[PDB]
Design a protein around this ligand. Structure first.
Ligand SMILES: C=C(C)[C@H]1CN[C@H](C(=O)O)[C@H]1CC(=O)O
Ligand SMILES: C=C(C)[C@H]1CN[C@H](C(=O)O)[C@H]1CC(=O)O
Ligand SMILES: C=C(C)[C@H]1CN[C@H](C(=O)O)[C@H]1CC(=O)O
Lengths: 83, 257, 76, 31, 51
């Protein structure tokens, strides 16, 4: 399913620090340059180990086998009502 | 932005995209809405079946020829017959086999073809022209971009003739609708979803977003309004007000929604 | 009279079995997987599958402070 | 995309006509 | 379907595809012009490959 709410992480700095505005501008720059994206793909997806089919199914024919056996059952029924 | 810098307005509330260049001159509140540059095209027509699609795999010539062949076999039998029935059997065998196969190829061709997935595919093909607004955050994004795909796309867009750029959103969308799917419009995800939820509903968004950014409320640098507005945006975000508002304007009253 | 009936019917069933045969190959296998829970709304409505969050943090506080129906129920 | 080829099948049509020709031949030598 | 599997083409049709998949490992010589080409290269695909 989807996400319950939409929010985000962030770099935290003490109120009134000289580092705050530089840090923010840095994050913006990294965001627009795609640094954050490439980093995410690096750690999450790129090395991701989890990652059409020509193969046989016994299951698809099973239903028709059921209608076959049912048909033969009806056949036995008719054979009985006749005799 | 100009009104904010030169003090003609105390605050700016609008789908204003947060960019570094704008963050240098003004102050942005925490984003109240999330978006991204996305691709809008014309959705393909579902079906136009006719009865002609059944006569498609086998040629009209083959139908006429098999009819005359049929009547020829009948008039031959009218005048030994074992090789006739045999040859006819082989004939209709080859034909029904051929029909079955060609029809199979039709059915492959139908579902197999994928028109567009991601922006990279747009960059790799010249068949479908594509463009953005005459101005705004998206165009500037493509322009300043050093990223391979976006660089290529920008080069094409600027160099392409006639101009692929449009003045307004409605113009771009109208261009998407009129072009029979030969034109793609690059616009922020929000607007795309909104237009996608509005009649005639002939347009759709394909693939993910090219980038991830957000809108925000802007206030003059050193304004007293900045921190209260920000804490307010946070309050609304946590309270779910923003979510309910988007559902209100975008989805809930959606005609095709 | 019945000969052309047999003929037309044979042609009909011929075209149909041919079409079915052709489409089945293309259809192949969907390999689709069933999902017990489609969305968060469904989760609130069933007691069969228990669910939880961390002992503390933003998620727990979200559920605690939530005035939204579904999330409220889930929290309770 | 449909070749719907009349040419490939044309040959089988030819062997059909040939078979019916031989058939007419046999029908003639019979009577 | 099986005979279309035989008819299936392009396991790897380009250098880019190697960059796009982690299943098949790939490499160059311990030294020489190729490795240095990949090291010094600033163009996207080959860069990724070098990384
Ligand atoms: C709709 C317009 C013209 C605005 C809205 N956001 C972008 C902005 O903040 O400039 C512009 C669109 C864009 O560039 O994708
Ligand atoms: C992993 C932990 C304990 C942290 C990380 N982010 C959330 C936070 O910032 O509160 C917490 C998880 C959570 O609340 O479910
Ligand atoms: C065969 C070797 C080691 C030499 C030949 N040319 C390259 C060179 O001129 O260094 C080297 C191969 C390579 O770098 O792939």
């Amino acid at each position: 399913g989807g996400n319950l709410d939409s929010k985000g992480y962030g770099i935290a700095t003490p109120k009134g620090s000289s580092l705050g505005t530089p840090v923010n501008l840095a994050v913006l720059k990294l965001s627009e340059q795609g640094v954050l994206d490439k980093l995410k793909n690096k750690w999450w997806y790129d090395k991701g180990e989890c990652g059409k089919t020509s193969a046989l199914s016994l299951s698809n024919v099973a239903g028709v086998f059921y209608i076959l056996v049912g048909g033969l059952g009806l056949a036995m029924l008719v054979a009985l009502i006749e005799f | 932005v100009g009104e904010l810098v030169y003090g003609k307005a105390d605050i700016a509330i609008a789908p204003l995209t947060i960019t570094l260049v704008r963050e240098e001159v003004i102050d942005f509140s925490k984003p109240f809405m999330s978006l991204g540059i996305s691709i809008m095209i014309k959705k393909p027509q579902k079906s136009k079946p006719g009865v002609f699609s059944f006569l498609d795999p086998l040629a009209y010539e083959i139908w006429m020829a098999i009819v005359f062949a049929y009547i020829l076999v009948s008039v031959v039998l009218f005048l030994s017959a074992r090789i006739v029935a045999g040859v006819w059997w082989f004939f209709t065998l080859i034909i029904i086999s051929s029909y079955t196969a060609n029809l199979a190829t039709f059915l492959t061709v139908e579902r197999m073809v994928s028109p567009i997935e991601s922006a990279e595919d747009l960059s790799k093909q010249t068949e479908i022209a594509y463009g953005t607004l005459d101005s705004g955050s998206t165009k500037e994004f493509f322009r300043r971009s050093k990223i391979a795909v976006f660089d290529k796309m920008w080069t094409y867009m600027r160099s392409a003739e006639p101009s692929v750029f449009v003045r307004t959103t409605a113009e771009g969308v109208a261009r998407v609708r009129k072009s029979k799917g030969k034109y793609a419009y690059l616009l922020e995800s929000t607007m795309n979803e909104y237009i996608e939820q509005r009649k005639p509903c002939d347009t759709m968004k394909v693939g993910g977003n090219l980038d991830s950014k957000g809108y925000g409320i802007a206030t003059p640098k050193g304004s007293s309004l900045g921190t209260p507005v920000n804490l307010a945006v946070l309050k609304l975000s946590e309270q779910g007000v923003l979510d309910k508002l988007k559902n209100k304007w975008w989805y809930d009253k959606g005609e095709c929604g």
